[PDB]
Design a protein around this ligand. Structure first.
Ligand code: HEM
Ligand code: HEM
Ligand code: NH4
Ligand code: NH4
Lengths: 137, 137
């Protein structure tokens, strides 16, 4: 289930973080503009840029912490607040986050690795609701 | 994105080249008049002609190079010049090129693969503008 999925992802965080992040940018190419250093780079090209590995690592580490602190795929109000208040997310709306989770769920469904994809969909919806409660437009 | 799409196509070049070129010819069957020995043949008959596979490969090899040398899907002027000045292209107008890119973009949208179709549309439009600047009618 969801908790095991967190263990799956954490076990090979670099690979899953990079895979899912690329799935996100490739599914929603207009999202790439937020990451100006990734413009004009193929998947394999990004995988040798230090910042790309570091960014995806840090993002998915945090996402897993929020996931782990959730109850029944409902994230904590304080965690939603952390995500809204981050300077790096100041220009974002909840639509950006929906897109990420749609891509993430599609990735999991397409994987050969078992995942509780429905629970990640639910988590994404609940996080979107929490981001709104916390003041993201 | 666009840069990744170049890798995707190069990773199965012969197959994508023939499939995209066939989409082009089937969408615009009167374009066959610029070629030799294509009329009156099905997709499979075309794919069994040695010259067909070799032509499509050479076209797509070069097209991917032009894409790869571009910045933000804007091709180099010298690449546009080369395409205009090729003896094989002497009787073409930019309309021929726009049709090829309409078919290519349509192919990408219809595919099961995550292409950045809008960036290929821009690339086609930018190529046409560049071909015009290079003197193609
Ligand atoms: C739950 C989902 C998300 C989490 C946990 C998360 C987490 C993070 C973290 C930890 C950083 C800082 C990383 C570092 O300092 O290296 C960061 C930066 C950033 N995030 Fe997010 N993020 C999420 C969703 C999104 C979405 C959906 C977008 C926009 C499409 C986005 C856009 C950005 C941008 C542009 C930066 C700055 C990166 C840079 O300057 O190189 N984030 N995020
Ligand atoms: C960016 C788009 C295009 C690229 C990269 C491209 C590239 C090429 C290349 C590499 C060749 C082979 C020349 C040689 O063997 O030395 C070729 C030949 C040719 N191309 Fe293109 N081409 C493009 C668009 C077009 C279009 C739109 C048409 C017509 C609708 C066209 C018509 C032809 C013809 C008629 C030949 C000669 C074929 C023959 O041997 O009978 N090309 N092209
Ligand atoms: N990946
Ligand atoms: N195809």
């Amino acid at each position: 289930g969801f908790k095991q999925d967190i263990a799956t992802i954490r076990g090979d965080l670099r690979t899953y973080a990079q895979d899912i992040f690329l799935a996100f940018l490739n599914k929603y190419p207009d999202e790439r503009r937020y990451f100006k250093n990734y413009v004009g780079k193929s998947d394999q090209e990004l995988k040798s840029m230090a910042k790309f590995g570091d960014h995806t690592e840090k993002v998915f580490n945090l996402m897993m912490e929020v996931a782990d602190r959730a109850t029944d795929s409902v994230p904590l109000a304080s965690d939603a607040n952390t995500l809204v208040q981050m300077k790096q997310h100041s220009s974002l709306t909840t639509g950006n986050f929906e897109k990420l989770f749609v891509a993430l769920v599609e990735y999991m469904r397409a994987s050969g690795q078992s995942f509780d994809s429905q629970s990640w969909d639910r988590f994404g919806k609940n996080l979107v609701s929490a981001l709104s409660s916390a003041g993201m437009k």
